[PDB]
Design a protein around this motif. Structure first.
Motif, PDB file in Angstrom:
ATOM      1  N   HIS A 136       0.970  -1.013  -0.049  1.00 16.65           N
ATOM      2  CA  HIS A 136       0.045  -0.014   0.034  1.00 16.65           C
ATOM      3  C   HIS A 136       0.916   1.238   0.030  1.00 16.65           C
ATOM      4  O   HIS A 136       0.440   2.441  -0.022  1.00 16.65           O
ATOM      5  CB  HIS A 136      -1.049   0.122   1.194  1.00 16.65           C
ATOM      6  CG  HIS A 136      -1.981  -0.869   1.295  1.00 16.65           C
ATOM      7  ND1 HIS A 136      -3.604  -0.499   1.647  1.00 16.65           N
ATOM      8  CD2 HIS A 136      -2.532  -1.892   0.479  1.00 16.65           C
ATOM      9  CE1 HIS A 136      -4.352  -1.489   1.250  1.00 16.65           C
ATOM     10  NE2 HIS A 136      -3.681  -2.665   0.829  1.00 16.65           N
ATOM     11  N   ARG A 149       2.041   9.987   1.995  1.00 15.74           N
ATOM     12  CA  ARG A 149       2.636   8.604   2.253  1.00 15.74           C
ATOM     13  C   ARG A 149       3.311   7.829   1.130  1.00 15.74           C
ATOM     14  O   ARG A 149       2.659   7.626   0.090  1.00 15.74           O
ATOM     15  CB  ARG A 149       1.149   7.769   2.316  1.00 15.74           C
ATOM     16  CG  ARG A 149       1.324   6.131   2.565  1.00 15.74           C
ATOM     17  CD  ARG A 149       0.363   5.880   3.622  1.00 15.74           C
ATOM     18  NE  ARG A 149      -0.146   4.473   3.337  1.00 15.74           N
ATOM     19  CZ  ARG A 149      -0.855   3.763   4.125  1.00 15.74           C
ATOM     20  NH1 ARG A 149      -1.072   4.237   5.339  1.00 15.74           N
ATOM     21  NH2 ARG A 149      -1.529   2.654   3.790  1.00 15.74           N
ATOM     22  N   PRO A 205       5.411   6.413  -1.747  1.00 18.06           N
ATOM     23  CA  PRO A 205       4.704   5.509  -2.937  1.00 18.06           C
ATOM     24  C   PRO A 205       5.635   4.369  -3.019  1.00 18.06           C
ATOM     25  O   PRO A 205       5.057   3.206  -3.284  1.00 18.06           O
ATOM     26  CB  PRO A 205       4.871   6.473  -4.298  1.00 18.06           C
ATOM     27  CG  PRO A 205       6.050   7.388  -3.808  1.00 18.06           C
ATOM     28  CD  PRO A 205       6.030   7.789  -2.430  1.00 18.06           C
ATOM     29  N   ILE A 254      -6.647   7.539   3.048  1.00 19.23           N
ATOM     30  CA  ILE A 254      -5.957   8.085   2.012  1.00 19.23           C
ATOM     31  C   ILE A 254      -6.872   8.783   1.091  1.00 19.23           C
ATOM     32  O   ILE A 254      -7.998   8.073   1.006  1.00 19.23           O
ATOM     33  CB  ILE A 254      -4.910   7.043   1.261  1.00 19.23           C
ATOM     34  CG1 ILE A 254      -4.146   6.481   2.514  1.00 19.23           C
ATOM     35  CG2 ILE A 254      -4.142   7.450   0.461  1.00 19.23           C
ATOM     36  CD1 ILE A 254      -3.211   5.165   1.797  1.00 19.23           C
ATOM     37  N   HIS A 255      -6.375   9.800   0.317  1.00 20.78           N
ATOM     38  CA  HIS A 255      -6.866  10.596  -0.552  1.00 20.78           C
ATOM     39  C   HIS A 255      -6.046  10.903  -1.595  1.00 20.78           C
ATOM     40  O   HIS A 255      -5.198  11.704  -1.513  1.00 20.78           O
ATOM     41  CB  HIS A 255      -7.903  11.802  -0.144  1.00 20.78           C
ATOM     42  CG  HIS A 255      -8.864  12.082  -1.041  1.00 20.78           C
ATOM     43  ND1 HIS A 255     -10.044  11.497  -1.133  1.00 20.78           N
ATOM     44  CD2 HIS A 255      -8.961  12.984  -1.863  1.00 20.78           C
ATOM     45  CE1 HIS A 255     -10.869  11.975  -2.237  1.00 20.78           C
ATOM     46  NE2 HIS A 255     -10.064  13.060  -2.463  1.00 20.78           N
ATOM     47  N   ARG A 256      -5.964  10.489  -3.069  1.00 22.39           N
ATOM     48  CA  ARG A 256      -5.292  10.804  -3.893  1.00 22.39           C
ATOM     49  C   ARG A 256      -5.213  12.077  -4.821  1.00 22.39           C
ATOM     50  O   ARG A 256      -6.420  12.650  -5.084  1.00 22.39           O
ATOM     51  CB  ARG A 256      -5.095   9.668  -4.902  1.00 22.39           C
ATOM     52  CG  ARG A 256      -4.543   8.136  -4.460  1.00 22.39           C
ATOM     53  CD  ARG A 256      -4.650   7.051  -5.493  1.00 22.39           C
ATOM     54  NE  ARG A 256      -3.967   6.077  -4.852  1.00 22.39           N
ATOM     55  CZ  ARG A 256      -2.754   5.623  -5.102  1.00 22.39           C
ATOM     56  NH1 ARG A 256      -1.922   6.367  -5.684  1.00 22.39           N
ATOM     57  NH2 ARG A 256      -2.348   4.426  -4.356  1.00 22.39           N
ATOM     58  N   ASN A 263       0.127  11.951  -5.634  1.00 22.22           N
ATOM     59  CA  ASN A 263       0.249  12.404  -4.259  1.00 22.22           C
ATOM     60  C   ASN A 263      -0.960  11.473  -3.704  1.00 22.22           C
ATOM     61  O   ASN A 263      -2.009  11.373  -4.044  1.00 22.22           O
ATOM     62  CB  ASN A 263       0.026  13.734  -4.003  1.00 22.22           C
ATOM     63  CG  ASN A 263       0.946  14.634  -4.612  1.00 22.22           C
ATOM     64  OD1 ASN A 263       1.909  14.375  -4.726  1.00 22.22           O
ATOM     65  ND2 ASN A 263       0.491  15.842  -5.081  1.00 22.22           N
ATOM     66  N   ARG A 264      -0.326  10.956  -2.303  1.00 21.16           N
ATOM     67  CA  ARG A 264      -1.440  10.301  -1.536  1.00 21.16           C
ATOM     68  C   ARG A 264      -1.768  11.270  -0.388  1.00 21.16           C
ATOM     69  O   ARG A 264      -1.228  10.899   0.862  1.00 21.16           O
ATOM     70  CB  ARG A 264      -0.608   8.806  -1.158  1.00 21.16           C
ATOM     71  CG  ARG A 264      -0.630   7.912  -2.352  1.00 21.16           C
ATOM     72  CD  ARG A 264       0.136   6.876  -2.304  1.00 21.16           C
ATOM     73  NE  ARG A 264       0.045   5.849  -3.456  1.00 21.16           N
ATOM     74  CZ  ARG A 264       1.159   5.032  -3.858  1.00 21.16           C
ATOM     75  NH1 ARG A 264       2.361   4.837  -3.280  1.00 21.16           N
ATOM     76  NH2 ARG A 264       0.964   4.287  -4.940  1.00 21.16           N
TER      77      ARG A 264
END
Length: 183
Positions: free
Chosen positions: A27, A47, A49, A150-152, A157-158
């Motif tokens: 993840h 977060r 990658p 998490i939101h992309r 970008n996370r």
């Protein structure tokens, strides 16, 4: 367990530096700092990658005078080596058009603006895997009925922002130093 316990089953030292990796291997694996929007520098908590990329160490302190931090304790997390435009290691939740968003500030936040977290346990497990929760203070002090997932971003970008319900699980691991920097 009432106290907080890490990955090698030991107790989470109070105000110790950790790596906030995820439960599931695939993840990503590291909380970091990316500069998005128009922050004149890296204040957006992201977060890593790269799965095998532990990401930065994070000081985990509580409100108590404890040698260990027990579940329940509101807590303040914070890049032990914060980026220059910070002068406050601490993470904090501001308001974006898309609601709450963990980031760093260029000024000192009051404690009640930093001390807005809480770790929650995961029962169907073996390791000590937790779910980061968030506490809103309106009329009355604490309320942890939120959740950090998490939101992309359009740039890979996370974004670590408050989510309806898709928490990010995290297994806390002790930091094997504290000199990792750019000194």
């Amino acid at each position: 367990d009432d106290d907080l316990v890490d990955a090698e089953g030991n107790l989470v030292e109070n105000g110790g530096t950790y790596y906030l990796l995820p439960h599931i291997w695939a993840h990503g694996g590291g909380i970091e700092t990316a500069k998005t929007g128009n922050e004149p520098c890296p204040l957006t908590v992201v977060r890593s990658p790269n799965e095998v990329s532990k990401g930065e160490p994070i000081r985990i302190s509580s409100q108590f005078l404890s040698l260990f931090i027990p579940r329940g304790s509101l807590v303040a997390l914070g890049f032990a080596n914060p980026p220059s435009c910070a002068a406050s290691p601490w993470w904090t939740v501001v308001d974006s058009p898309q609601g709450p968003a963990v980031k760093l500030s260029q000024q000192k936040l009051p404690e009640k603006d930093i001390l807005v977290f809480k770790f929650e346990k995961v029962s169907h497990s073996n390791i000590h895997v937790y779910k980061l929760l968030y506490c809103q203070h309106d009329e009355e002090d604490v309320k942890c009925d939120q959740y950090i997932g998490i939101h992309r971003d359009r740039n890979g970008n996370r974004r670590l922002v408050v989510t309806e319900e898709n928490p990010l699980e995290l297994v806390l691991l002790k930091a094997k130093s504290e000199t990792a920097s750019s000194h």
